[PDB]
Amino acid sequence: FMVSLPRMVYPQPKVLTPCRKDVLVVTPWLAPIVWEGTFNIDILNEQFRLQNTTIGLTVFAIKKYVAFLKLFLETAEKHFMVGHRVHYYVFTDQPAAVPRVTLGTGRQLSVLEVSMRRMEMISDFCERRFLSEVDYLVCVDVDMEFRDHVGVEILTPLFGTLHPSFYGSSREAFTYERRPQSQAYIPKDEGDFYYMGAFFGGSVQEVQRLTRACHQAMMVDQANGIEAVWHDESHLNKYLLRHKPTKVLSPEYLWDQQLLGWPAVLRKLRFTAVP
């Protein structure tokens, strides 16, 4: 059950004036593509706070990648879901190497000691835990930093993020798995977008479905002596082709400024690669 929003004063949306004319803001299956200027964060914050929403953020930091955690977590504290309940799940082979980062109120961190690892870890071993503890799961790479707002505008049953290298590419150019012998296979005449494996999520239920499907597909591939060209990203793309995401995040949400600069189409760089 959802209680009424309170009275709010904000600019009237204008039917005959789009928020953004330079980009596609809705997919052909009527999922929003999230760009700056398309959402009023005050309305969304109200909607999600009224549901006392908890967001889980999963991150793997294995071997040398533990070095990335300090900046990852500190910047997440500045920019990720601020105002909402957040539970970080840090999967690592070195629990002692996790930095002690100061968290805001209503935010907590759990250290979970540990090609297929991530999908299996999220689906296989953590299923009951997540269902009991959070409403949404967000799965990201650790070698990143937040630079701007990443908030409840992303939350939806199932989302993927446009890969920053391919958002302008024709589908024939997408680096999907192209060998029919792989479960991740996508023909040259299929594909909506190329999603990056570094940022996906949704409700706990939908995320477990996705990770379970990808893990199963990867096991089949292993048994058949094949490894998809881009590993679990290839499988993520196959899954999101056949199960359309309910929102798609623009490349604001996954950018590499060193590699790609700062095009006019991006009003904000929100979550970026560490050089």
Side-chain angles (χ1 to χ4, degrees), residues 55-59 72-78 80 86-90 103 107-112 146:
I55 306 91
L57 181 59
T58 68
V59 66
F72 175 91
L73 298 165
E74 290 171 338
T75 61
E77 282 298 302
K78 289 182 169 61
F80 180 77
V86 168
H87 197 146
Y88 299 102
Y89 298 96
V90 176
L103 309 183
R107 307 173 71 97
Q108 62 186 294
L109 187 144
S110 296
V111 174
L112 296 322
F146 293 84

Side-chain angles (χ1 to χ4, degrees), residues 29 166 169-180 182-195 234 237-244:
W29 56 94
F166 302 104
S169 297
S170 284
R171 51 155 70 113
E172 18 287 340
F174 291 164
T175 56
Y176 292 148
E177 179 52 63
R178 303 303 192 173
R179 297 168 289 174
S182 176
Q183 295 313 297
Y185 167 64
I186 302 171
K188 284 271 180 86
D189 55 356
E190 293 180 54
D192 304 306
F193 302 113
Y194 195 81
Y195 305 100
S234 297
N237 274 280
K238 179 62 169 286
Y239 188 88
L240 292 179
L241 175 63
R242 304 299 197 95
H243 306 84
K244 306 303 192 194

Side-chain angles (χ1 to χ4, degrees), residues 53-67:
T53 301
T54 307
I55 306 91
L57 181 59
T58 68
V59 66
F60 289 69
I62 300 297
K63 304 184 215 156
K64 300 286 99 194
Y65 283 79
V66 298

Side-chain angles (χ1 to χ4, degrees), residues 69-104:
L69 283 158
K70 186 165 179 286
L71 182 69
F72 175 91
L73 298 165
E74 290 171 338
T75 61
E77 282 298 302
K78 289 182 169 61
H79 297 293
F80 180 77
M81 301 293 169
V82 172
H84 295 93
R85 299 173 68 143
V86 168
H87 197 146
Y88 299 102
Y89 298 96
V90 176
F91 295 84
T92 184
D93 60 343
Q94 307 153 75
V98 179
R100 187 198 290 132
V101 168
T102 310
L103 309 183

Side-chain angles (χ1 to χ4, degrees), residues 27-273:
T27 69
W29 56 94
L30 296 180
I33 308 175
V34 179
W35 299 89
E36 186 62 11
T38 67
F39 58 91
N40 183 139
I41 198 55
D42 296 322
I43 305 173
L44 298 172
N45 279 329
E46 280 283 346
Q47 293 182 307
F48 282 91
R49 270 310 292 152
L50 288 168
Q51 293 272 300
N52 197 205
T53 301
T54 307
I55 306 91
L57 181 59
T58 68
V59 66
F60 289 69
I62 300 297
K63 304 184 215 156
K64 300 286 99 194
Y65 283 79
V66 298
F68 289 105
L69 283 158
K70 186 165 179 286
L71 182 69
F72 175 91
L73 298 165
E74 290 171 338
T75 61
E77 282 298 302
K78 289 182 169 61
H79 297 293
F80 180 77
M81 301 293 169
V82 172
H84 295 93
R85 299 173 68 143
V86 168
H87 197 146
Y88 299 102
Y89 298 96
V90 176
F91 295 84
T92 184
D93 60 343
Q94 307 153 75
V98 179
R100 187 198 290 132
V101 168
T102 310
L103 309 183
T105 188
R107 307 173 71 97
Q108 62 186 294
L109 187 144
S110 296
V111 174
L112 296 322
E113 192 171 359
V114 301
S115 196
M116 288 193 313
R117 195 217 334 268
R118 179 258 279 293
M119 295 300 177
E120 183 188 9
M121 287 291 167
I122 296 165
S123 70
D124 223 294
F125 309 134
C126 295
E127 195 157 9
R128 298 176 200 268
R129 200 146 150 22
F130 294 146
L131 283 167
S132 68
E133 295 190 329
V134 303
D135 297 305
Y136 293 92
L137 279 172
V138 177
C139 308
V140 304
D141 284 359
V142 72
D143 59 337
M144 303 288 197
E145 62 173 317
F146 293 84
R147 298 185 28 176
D148 210 329
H149 168 100
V150 173
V152 299
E153 71 276 3
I154 74 176
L155 302 177
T156 191
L158 181 62
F159 71 85
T161 301
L162 296 182
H163 186 124
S165 291
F166 302 104
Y167 66 92
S169 297
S170 284
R171 51 155 70 113
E172 18 287 340
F174 291 164
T175 56
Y176 292 148
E177 179 52 63
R178 303 303 192 173
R179 297 168 289 174
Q181 300 74 31
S182 176
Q183 295 313 297
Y185 167 64
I186 302 171
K188 284 271 180 86
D189 55 356
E190 293 180 54
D192 304 306
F193 302 113
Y194 195 81
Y195 305 100
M196 189 155 197
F199 195 162
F200 63 91
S203 67
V204 176
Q205 178 167 227
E206 289 300 311
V207 176
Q208 291 167 341
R209 284 175 169 154
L210 178 153
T211 56
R212 182 180 310 123
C214 294
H215 171 43
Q216 288 177 182
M218 291 174 86
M219 294 187 309
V220 175
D221 271 14
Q222 276 205 36
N224 294 158
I226 190 165
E227 174 70 12
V229 60
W230 288 108
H231 316 293
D232 67 5
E233 176 171 278
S234 297
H235 290 95
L236 172 73
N237 274 280
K238 179 62 169 286
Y239 188 88
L240 292 179
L241 175 63
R242 304 299 197 95
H243 306 84
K244 306 303 192 194
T246 52
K247 291 185 178 165
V248 174
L249 306 188
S250 71
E252 302 166 356
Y253 287 89
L254 215 44
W255 199 252
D256 185 332
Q257 195 184 6
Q258 171 187 246
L259 176 75
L260 295 161
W262 194 338
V265 76
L266 299 179
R267 302 183 171 186
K268 296 191 171 201
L269 303 186
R270 305 174 190 274
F271 184 51
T272 63

